[PDB]
Write a protein that binds this ligand. Structure first.
Ligand SMILES: CN1CCN(Cc2ccc(NCc3cccc(F)c3)cc2)CC1
Ligand SMILES: CN1CCN(Cc2ccc(NCc3cccc(F)c3)cc2)CC1
Ligand SMILES: CN1CCN(Cc2ccc(NCc3cccc(F)c3)cc2)CC1
Ligand SMILES: CCCCCCCCCCCCCC(=O)O
Ligand SMILES: CCCCCCCCCCCCCC(=O)O
Ligand SMILES: CCCCCCCCCCCCCC(=O)O
Lengths: 280, 251, 238, 59, 280, 59, 60, 238, 280, 59
């Protein structure tokens, strides 16, 4: 046998109910117990038999978090006077982009594999003389785990990666893609950390303390045109094989810092004319 | 009758005559660490009855203008009995807890309290940007008070009650384990919290496992009467506590 | 080699695709798994938990916490309305920011029944009866208890049990409804009226409050993921 | 290696697909979005004593 | 067994017929019953035996509607002063292009999967100075289900899709393609809707009421050339797994509105000299 | 998974093709344009009482 | 990997092709089917229905 | 031919991929293999070998070889410290260039226990006792033998056996620790104190020396390869 | 059966230990024997039972050396006055790049297959007139085993390789790649050679004596633009099927010559205030 | 030719991949990084007489 046939679940159906007159009171309960009532419409009114074929397939965490989302973008020039402006250096983190940040912060602990995709585009900077002929460009993406050497210029020796993984990509082809496993020292990623760094309750406070994922560096391999050219890189993350624990309420206030929970007080919700107004 | 409950830990006992049932964390009872999940090598110490017992914290007054209070654990019990000593003398710790909050009033009083345990209740500063010492949210067993208006002092946490200092809707805290103390039908709330963390054990002085919050959602009211306030008391008891990593004391 | 031809779609990047890709950390040993308490496997599990509904949005609430309390008095006309609201869980301001509205706002279609739980937070000596009714979609919302009681309703008696549950049935012409509801997919109204009134003995407060909890039944479901409009940014965070 | 399984489709209205893995790391496999098991009891019924819906909540 | 041999229908044959003289009158019938006569040439005249191998394979609805057809085109510039002119925003609908509109409107209700293909082309705008060097361009196609946020400018935050599906495509490769399932809230798409929106018979009238499919947005990812460049996108729809109900007569009058049935009266057909004229 | 079936060809004048599905969604499959069943009775004979062609339509 | 060569016709868009493509709404649950009266499966069925012929086209 | 579509990642060069490629010397006959002594199959085998630790980094060492010797004297206060150091095998200057530190610096994560072996290189007539203690992470390192002995420790008696082994246990909250250690992943301290003192007979030197050896236990492991920072160049070598 | 199911090893576990009082002294040993003690924490202190799932998969020599690393780069122009500047000629060796050199020099003898990848990029040289149109360029990589003819100019006859393997690559495609077997005359590569070339202990000394791997040549096939264009090539080596013998301590001093062990004395390590200082 | 083997994965928490060789030279095959055998005795215990950890090293 060279083939294995690994080879679903619909919502609950509604059962028929007739008139009732008894001492049982399903409608009456007590929320003080912290228990959410499990009543169904069949307990309060007469209902017909209905077979439901709806499924909750699209509400699973795997599908909810299984969408690529932008997490960072930066620009770097092929040639310029400032050395720091010819390459990018980004400390990896998921708190930069608001949509993905809020999506992730609905759970306290996460454990998943990651799929990273890079989108790179280039454009010629405005200027008087734009007449030039330049072959196709090539880019290098370098990942440096924590503690490794960091390049200080575009043509530094550190770009000769011998152990650090890297990707060389040429313009005009499909976007680069790659997978990365679960690389946390702990048993799961923590979106929130209520604690300090030092043992005497001092120093850094918050999730910043647990961010030790490394850095990413990007440069033009050898392109140096007579006239400046600007390139932009976009990083997309896509969790795979996800698991989550301890859900928490979604955030209500707008984000204001990339490494803190600071916020400004916000009203609970919008207002209306009065408690009885029901019209538009 | 199911309105009477009795809990016995160590050499202490709690008896309540009017009470709802007990909420058990996320359906998991506290338990010791397994051999296939541990990481530390040396033998742990399991002080049992010595540490697994009820401790009474200071009591607070519930006025007509109260807004709420919070406590952070285990920093609240950091200086209580032998539990505090074991915390001081060890590098790693692990323990569940049982929380019992008590509030009694006559049949002519009205009000409602929300009791909830929030794991990893990270809080933001009053001024976005500045930072605070480890004194604006935890200074032992003393209770910290929420505020009706927006906080302005830069040295303390944002105490806006409707945001709960976490930037989330106060009404959505129902997702966490919780109970309601409604003076009509209830006098106490009981919650059993298992050890929840991303690692098998942890330093009890550096990390706040969870935060306890009490929020009046229906302000206290009464008429006439010689009673001017309703005291609130909180009792906690570690369960299945064990420690590891004997170093010198002093936290 | 093997002859082949590329079809449309090659070299494209679709954000919702499922393809295998190489691993850049070969033979990496992951940390052993640990069973942390409280594992969540489906967002409907979160959606099925109760949450307080801020019904009292009276446009002049100086104190935010007032939004959660529905006032009640001792002496009121024989028939009077306590509150009224539209049943638009994903669009109405009342349900917008609840634990259920937040989940719904990440989707486009929804279906199933809903639970509304009301709890009386008055004195233990107070008593009363209330009529809570659900009116399916129509050209005009009810204006009096006489009109209201014609639709689905329940009579709530306040006693030792301090909570009552109104189960809103799923009555619709389509299998699904839009989260961004319109006239075509309207859902109806919910109103509450005094059935007998509130009576108190001497030496008790003259006013009380009620709170409402919203949650989804076991037949609830969602569809067509989308991006929520409640969160936005103008510049890169730093 | 061939792994055959049904594909998502409609209700009361072949549906099989083949999959093969090409890499030696499990992290390289495609998303396993075919699991639909769920249990809301952990959050909806966290009480100790079982409560019957028909019977009164208290006493 | 690793292989399943799933593994047609010709028109009716003509049977031989001889001279007849009897009381049966197949030729005579009565159309007042609403019944179409089922007579065959073999009933009215002598015929030989003929075996027909013709098949109606190409007349099935699946094949009739199984052809890609253009449904929309729009132009957007890489750089311009007007913000609204640098991206496209189209409410999805099939009433824009006359040929596909008429093909679809031969049935009242439809239920099918959809296959969407995008064709994108670019050209340099005329101007004095055209000498420039620009790398290959990249485009983003964003789909926003109803109720989601809508971008207001080319560089808006909404372009960081975290849940909204999107496609990134680079010029010079094959056209983008993608499939979409049956996404109607009802049990089938309705080409015609004789009814109103409000319950008191007021408001919008027609099929416009049931059009809630969403929007599509397109932009240049980061291309901004020194001189303007214009791009055009063409959208092609291709129904799959089709089913149809309640056929209706094909339209006779020319279309005049994209969201209405309004028309101008038209003659039934062309004229000829007289009822007997048969010549050219 | 392999699915073998005949291909369209001529009359009285191997013809098999193989197909395999690669995606987990039935909507991704190719068009099923091999069905040729039809029944015009619904529109040609919608009357209640069966009418015989040989016999008179009325009486 | 596996050696291959592209043949003529690659990267072309033929409006009458039958190829599989990815789905952008994975695990989407479609509405249950319902048997509406009057299903049509072939255009010849429509073509076999009678219709009035405008024979009197007399130009006036 | 066979229809196909290219997915993202095509035409990329990933330095850590595993793919087949053509051979440019077909049917090349390689030299027969020979079993040379001393085959190494795993870097942990190298990491498990002892190496001398340069503990005496006193900032004024005119002679480099002095770094390997820990001084000891005959007459010292009753309780006195011999040496102290931080347990950061991959970052501390003491362990940086050892045979274990060099291996660790090629990785990012490490876990397991460590062995510290001390050898007395005094006269055969000399005698003494020493207390060696390991203090898990804390807010303050020990300052006196009274504080030191509270943690894990061993009493070393000098006799015919000239070596003693202190096995540092793996006590950590996480399964792994960063090579670039910080306050969060601190590991503790190691100190040595006089237990009884050193006593010598007449006609012997008044001073002696001790040496320390570092190695990994059989449960040691590493992870997350990376490039070492100890070696760098400015121009192409010629 | 058309399929063969070829179809791991965790670190040692910790066993439980209780109080002990006996004559056995595992802690005491003697390093004078050259034997490394095999004691475990369970012999010196009480320990709990712990099951370890950690594995040493990533520490094997195969994975340690199984990463592509740059070994050489050089520039050659498409057109120039100097003949020697229009092509490259490199004697193969692994001592040019410091990172890979140090990684390889941790073992005395090695035996592996090799995977070679070439990355080529081009750029237009600065100058007044840059306006030109040039089709895509093509490059030739030639490998000449020792003793073969060597080209002396870009258009030499030797570029007509009849037995020498070569690769022709066009810009815009994936980087060239190729494999090479174990090609040593001896039974294994030797990183160090303590000996001379002549039998009377004279001549070349060191590993230079054993470097007879050949040369690599690169040129533009026929590209000769009106204006100069510069191209850069990068060579990456990736050992496969590796085996190593006789490990040796890692180097401490910085490299200074490409074909010698010469060095400058270096301190053993960094200093600190005193033998008791433990603070930062 | 098909060669099925397990892939790397986690502990106590299908995992098979298929491989086929296309070239006639063994040097063209992919890296065999699935071997995890090791023996540190050659460097840790190079002595002639076996030494017992419990017993004294000398005498
Ligand atoms: C403080 N934690 C940090 C991790 N954060 C979740 C997370 C986000 C992104 C990643 N990316 C890991 C990764 C994956 C691939 C390549 C890389 F360079 C890095 C890991 C964890 C939660 C908060
Ligand atoms: C009022 N109805 C609207 C639907 N119309 C048929 C129809 C046409 C196109 C579509 N396209 C759905 C689709 C498919 C793929 C991507 C999208 F953004 C949208 C759906 C239904 C009939 C009249
Ligand atoms: C003196 N020896 C020379 C070999 N060196 C190791 C070594 C490095 C690279 C190579 N490359 C061989 C090769 C592989 C492919 C193409 C070529 F032209 C050459 C061979 C051996 C160790 C010191
Ligand atoms: C690296 C794996 C390449 C696989 C190439 C396609 C499959 C060829 C073999 C036919 C499928 C049988 C696989 C199996 O035996 O499990
Ligand atoms: C994602 C599926 C990739 C399939 C690759 C081509 C088929 C390889 C296996 C040979 C065909 C047998 C399939 C089957 O067992 O049904
Ligand atoms: C040059 C080899 C090309 C192989 C093409 C893919 C495999 C096709 C045959 C299916 C797998 C069976 C191989 C086998 O019998 O071992």
């Amino acid at each position: 046998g060279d083939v294995e046939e690994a080879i679903v679940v619909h919502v609950a159906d509604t059962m028929r109910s007739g008139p009732s007159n008894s001492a049982s009171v399903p409608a009456l309960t007590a929320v003080e117990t912290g228990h959410t009532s499990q009543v169904t419409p069949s307990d309060t009114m007469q209902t017909r038999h209905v077979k439901n074929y709806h499924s909750r397939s699209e509400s699973t965490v795997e599908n909810f978090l299984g969408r690529s989302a932008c997490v960072y973008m930066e620009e770097y020039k092929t040639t310029d006077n400032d050395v720091n402006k010819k390459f990018v250096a980004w400390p990896i983190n998921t708190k930069q982009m608001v949509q993905m940040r809020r999506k992730l912060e609905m759970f306290t602990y996460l454990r998943f594999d990651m799929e990273v995709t890079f989108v790179i585009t280039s454009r010629q900077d405005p200027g008087t003389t734009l007449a030039q002929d330049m072959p196709v460009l090539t880019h290098q993406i370098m990942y440096v785990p924590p503690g490794g050497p960091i390049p200080a210029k575009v043509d530094d020796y550190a770009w000769q990666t011998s152990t650090n993984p890297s990707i060389f990509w040429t313009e005009g082809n499909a976007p680069a893609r790659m997978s990365i496993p679960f690389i946390s020292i702990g048993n799961a990623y923590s979106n929130f950390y209520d604690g300090w760094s030092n043992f005497d309750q001092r120093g850094s406070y918050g999730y910043n303390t647990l961010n030790n994922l490394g850095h990413i560096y990007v440069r033009h391999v050898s392109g140096s045109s007579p006239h400046p050219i600007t390139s932009t890189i976009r990083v997309y993350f896509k969790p795979k094989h996800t698991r989550a624990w301890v859900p928490r309420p979604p955030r209500l206030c707008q984000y204001k810092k990339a490494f803190s929970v600071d916020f400004t007080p916000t009203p609970i919700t919008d207002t209306r004319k009065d408690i009885n107004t029901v019209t538009t | 009758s199911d309105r009477v409950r009795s809990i016995t830990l160590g050499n202490s006992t709690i008896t309540t005559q009017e009470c709802a049932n007990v909420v058990v964390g996320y359906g998991r009872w506290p338990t010791y660490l397994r051999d296939d999940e541990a990481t530390a090598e040396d033998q742990p110490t399991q002080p049992d009855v010595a540490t697994c017992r009820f401790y009474t914290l200071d009591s607070i007054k519930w006025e007509k203008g109260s807004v709420g209070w919070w406590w952070k654990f285990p920093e609240a019990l950091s200086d209580m009995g032998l539990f505090g000593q074991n915390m001081q003398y060890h590098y790693l710790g692990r323990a569940g807890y049982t929380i019992h909050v008590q509030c009694n009033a006559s049949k002519f009083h009205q009000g409602c309290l929300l009791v909830v345990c929030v794991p990893e209740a990270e809080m933001g500063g009053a001024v976005v940007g500045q930072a605070f010492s480890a004194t604006a949210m935890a200074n032992g067993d003393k209770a910290y008070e929420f505020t009706s208006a927006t906080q302005s002092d830069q040295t303390k946490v944002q105490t806006a009650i409707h945001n709960a200092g976490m930037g989330v809707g106060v009404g959505n805290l129902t997702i966490y384990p919780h109970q309601w103390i409604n003076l009509r039908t209830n006098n106490s709330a009981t919650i059993v919290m298992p050890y929840i963390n991303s690692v098998p054990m942890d330093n009890m002085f550096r990390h706040y496992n969870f935060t306890l919050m009490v929020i009046p959602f229906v302000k206290l009211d009464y008429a006439d009467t010689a009673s001017t306030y309703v005291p609130i008391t909180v009792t906690v008891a570690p369960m299945c506590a064990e420690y590891n990593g004997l170093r010198l004391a002093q936290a | 080699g093997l002859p082949t031809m590329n079809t449309p779609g090659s070299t494209q990047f679709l954000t919702s695709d499922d393809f295998q890709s190489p691993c850049a950390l070969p033979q990496f040993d992951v940390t052993p798994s640990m069973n942390i308490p409280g594992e969540v496997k489906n967002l409907m599990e979160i959606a099925e938990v109760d949450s307080v509904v801020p019904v009292n949005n009276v446009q002049d609430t100086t104190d935010q916490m007032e939004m959660f309390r529905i006032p009640v008095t001792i002496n009121a006309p024989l028939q009077q309305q306590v509150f009224g609201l539209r049943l638009q869980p994903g669009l109405d301001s009342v349900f917008k920011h609840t634990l259920l509205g937040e989940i719904l706002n990440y989707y486009a279609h929804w279906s199933g029944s809903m639970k509304l739980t009301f709890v009386f937070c008055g004195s233990a000596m107070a008593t009363g009866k209330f009529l809570i009714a659900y009116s399916p979609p129509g050209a005009n919302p009810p204006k009096t208890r006489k009109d209201a009681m014609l639709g689905t309703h329940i009579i709530w008696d306040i006693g030792l049990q301090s909570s009552c549950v109104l189960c809103v049935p799923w009555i619709s012409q389509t299998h699904y409804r839009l989260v961004q509801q319109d006239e075509y997919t309207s859902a109806g109204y919910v109103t509450c009226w005094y059935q007998t009134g509130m009576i108190v003995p001497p030496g008790t407060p003259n006013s009380s409050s009620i709170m409402c909890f919203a949650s989804a039944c076991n037949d609830f479901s969602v569809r067509m993921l989308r991006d929520t409009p409640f969160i936005s940014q103008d510049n890169k965070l730093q | 290696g061939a792994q055959v399984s049904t594909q998502k489709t409609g209700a009361h209205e072949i549906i099989h697909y083949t999959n093969i893995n090409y890499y030696k790391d499990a992290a390289s496999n495609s998303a396993n979005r075919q699991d639909f098991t769920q249990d809301p009891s952990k959050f909806t019924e966290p009480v100790k004593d079982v409560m019957i819906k028909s019977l009164p909540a208290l006493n």
